[PDB]
Symmetry: D4
Subunit: 150 residues, 8 copies
């Protein structure tokens, strides 16, 4: 990757629906070269794909919760709990963090009831789980994970 | 929105690079009707846009940190700190949560040094900030915020 | 329920001993219509009943304690502990909360000894119980759960 | 108060809509004596009144939150914050507890938005307030504050 | 007990080596009446005895530690741990407290090594013990448990 | 101090009302030598005095509380708060501990009201005080500070 | 050890590569006496040896972590965990502390991956380990353990 | 640096008092080449020096404490506190850590009194300091910071 690829990615991270023309004109390079560079980035794994950005509100995903989960120590309990958490419907993020030394889980549901049935109740029945603390997000000030180039 | 729009969105959330043909054939509806429905979803704000999914690793974004921030109480301190946090380079997520009653900030940097210079040092100089706790993500088990329809 | 029912409920939540006359005169509606509306609210479950408000102090209920209880995770431990807590004499409130991710128990006793014998000792013998923290209420600034319409 | 008054109160705490007949027949005492005893209990302050029990769900009071509040120390800050908390619309309970050495606030709202506007935002602007932690009640296992005689 | 007994106790709590004369002259009552009152207080259990106040420093009791101990819940674990703690050499105080909902243990030792051998190591081997936190007293600002009448 | 003084102190710490005869007979030494040794211990400061042990229960000292107090840092705030705490009526113990890095205060009162008026309210008005946590002692398993020789 | 030995040690703790001449001239004593004193300090165990001070940065030891570890109570679990921790590659410090009543572990690794593989993963599989909290050192303000004489 | 330098450093980190002969014979390289390599490592900053390892016990450094320090946020308070901490006599380590988001300070003193006078009292008077928690090390299981090559 070179400076030019970065200029291309900086654009595609915001809007992937531009025409090779506009981009080429902005970056000041041959459209055939652009198309090539973009195809190379996809083959190399830099660009893993293209998604439609759906407004979670439009889907009534009003009950957002960030949950910290502590796993009991011993015989692979930690690694197994991570994958169990990632398969729960509504869970889009699972991170293991150093400090708290536990899992941070990001999930979205339409209501409290759905959250309890699909996430909370399920997580509570997991024996490996030592403890949890579910944080209710009452305000999304920002959420743009797509922006990787600042 | 109807059941059909959901089938369309469920596809576009994963791959927006399909052809109206394939989708139409899968959903079993006229391509002209599909194109219409999709254009309507965009005009209605359900589909806010289309992004390229860039692999953060490809950009050496190795230092990932989830930081909790406590703001001092009183005269609009809380709301102001939120926007200050969202403008920091490298910060893609800022949420205010109930329970901890503080801000949860998601950020990505190439190294510890960048993180300290762009995020930590800056956050420390903010007077409104009462306290913080930065969690180092040492493992991303899952991160698919684009998946809103399960 | 309409605006008129709300005016009726706003009154009955404070004093259910009024006469259909006074209320009718205040709300400015036929006494026969009032009686009907009230009977409908009872049949519909809005008005679950009428209670006498007894001053807890008059019963020497001097030892008030708000206890948080953490249940161990796994095989229905959580749901079972909740009902065990609600059957304890002196316990009038049991809530499961998100954040602390534990039960909050409200209880009233005449003395420390009664509290220990009827609540504390009993709760300690429950194996499902992971941990507890009992908060001693030394001052009731307000307690009007009957006021649901502000 | 004697054993007989307790039998009367034990009944009235559950249902104040009984007839002096039924109660008299159950307690086995003259209806004129009952009426007298009840009037005495009201004059003495044991029975502070009679309320209609309204099902909070019937009023869409779905967002229930138990909040702990820490007040800064010094010049009457503690006592003043207590009364400020009790005047907030939607707040039915305010207790000062020993141990946590802070205020426990019980509130009910129809939605997250109402809660934020009427409670959270208001509490955040109070300078005396050091810190808070709002617990989201996702399940009411029991709530019968009217039962003072077990 | 009357006002006079209190005046007697207020004196004896500070210095039990006074003569019945001095005390009688100070309290302004017959020495024979004093002797009687004091003998009555002993027979009644108010005065449980008379001790020599030994300066702990004179015995090289330099390592003072206040330890909080959490016992696991279930089958009489709590009550049993309390008595086990009270029999440890060097432990002069054991209290069960509400709030922390654990035992507070006061102990004194000549050195760190003695403390580790007689207290810490022993406490660690107790299975019922969930967790502990030992606070090192580096300054005794006051310690007059003998003063019960202020 | 020698082995013999220790045998004397071990006795006097439990009961200072023995006769020089009994003690001399038990220790197997001349009564004149005993009297001398004891007088020397008093002059040397080992024996600071003799107190009457009054049963706190006999004085209705039912509300026992162990309070941890955190002082703000800076200009002699710590040392000043310690002496302010030790002068509070009902407070018999004040220790500064390493770990929690705060003051531990032992106090006794007849009732909750007295505790609030004499201790809590007073402590809350102290500006230097950062935070506190008052632990309610609901059970004294042991309290023998007089026993310094085991 | 005398004042002169201290002057010698104060020098050798900083730089052990000086010549007996320079030191002798600085301390103002016969070189033969110096050599003797130094040999005595080594034989007596004061000087346990001489090491080369290697700059950790020069070895790419960029991932520094201070981890607190809580061991479960009971049958020698504590002492055994300590030695298990000290044998982990990359761990240079293991301390058992009073207060937190847990182990503090100092370790150094080249990267996050090495840290996870050699330390974290290994520690997680230890059953005796109750919980841990790994603190990421992002700045070494000072690290001179060799300086024992100030 | 190459594999050979590492073999040299691995030796010098343990014992810098070996002769170029022994080392050369062990590493199997010309003594003149060794001397050169070692001189290069010193000029390059890998080997910052050579110290005498003094047994802290030999200096009566019995009071070891690991203290966590929280600095108030705002105008360079954090960076300034770090250097203030590093200049305190007896302090050999100061680290700023991510997670706890505070300073970890390692210090050694002969007694509690010295610790209080040189460290604690001084740290308490620092206004920038928000809070601290000093952990008493009662057992050094391992302390070999000199070992950088495992
Ligand atoms: N930007 C453009 O469209 C130029 C294209 C270029 N001439 C080519 O060879 O494709
Ligand atoms: N799926 C298709 O391509 C059919 C298209 C449809 N016949 C139209 O009117 O556009
Ligand atoms: N408020 C009243 O009492 C009026 C009653 C009304 N006239 C009826 O039909 O009952
Ligand atoms: N229970 C009753 O109704 C009896 C009443 C009773 N005879 C009276 O004097 O009122
Ligand atoms: N205070 C005194 O010694 C008076 C004693 C009193 N006269 C008696 O009867 O013993
Ligand atoms: N124990 C005794 O009373 C002996 C006393 C001893 N003969 C003396 O000289 O006082
Ligand atoms: N400082 C010196 O080198 C003097 C040495 C001294 N004359 C001896 O006997 O070794
Ligand atoms: N290891 C040795 O001492 C050999 C030294 C080597 N011959 C030189 O040139 O110095
Ligand atoms: Mg996307
Ligand atoms: Mg009621
Ligand atoms: Mg005494
Ligand atoms: Mg060294």
């Amino acid at each position: 990757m070179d400076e030019i690829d970065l200029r291309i990615l900086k654009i595609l991270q915001y809007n992937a629906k531009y025409s090779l023309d506009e981009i080429a004109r902005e970056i000041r390079i041959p459209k055939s070269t652009l198309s090539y560079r973009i195809k190379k980035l996809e083959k190399d794994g830099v660009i893993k794909g293209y998604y439609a950005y759906i407004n979670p509100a439009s889907l009534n995903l009003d009950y957002i919760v960030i949950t910290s989960v502590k796993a009991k120590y011993g015989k692979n309990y930690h690694v197994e709990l991570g994958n169990k958490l990632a398969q729960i419907p509504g869970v889009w993020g699972v991170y293991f963090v150093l400090g708290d030394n536990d899992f941070i889980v990001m999930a979205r549901y339409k209501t409290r009831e759905e959250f309890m049935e699909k996430f909370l109740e399920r997580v509570m029945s997991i024996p490996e789980v030592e403890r949890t603390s579910a944080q209710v997000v009452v305000k999304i000030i920002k959420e743009s994970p797509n922006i990787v180039i600042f």
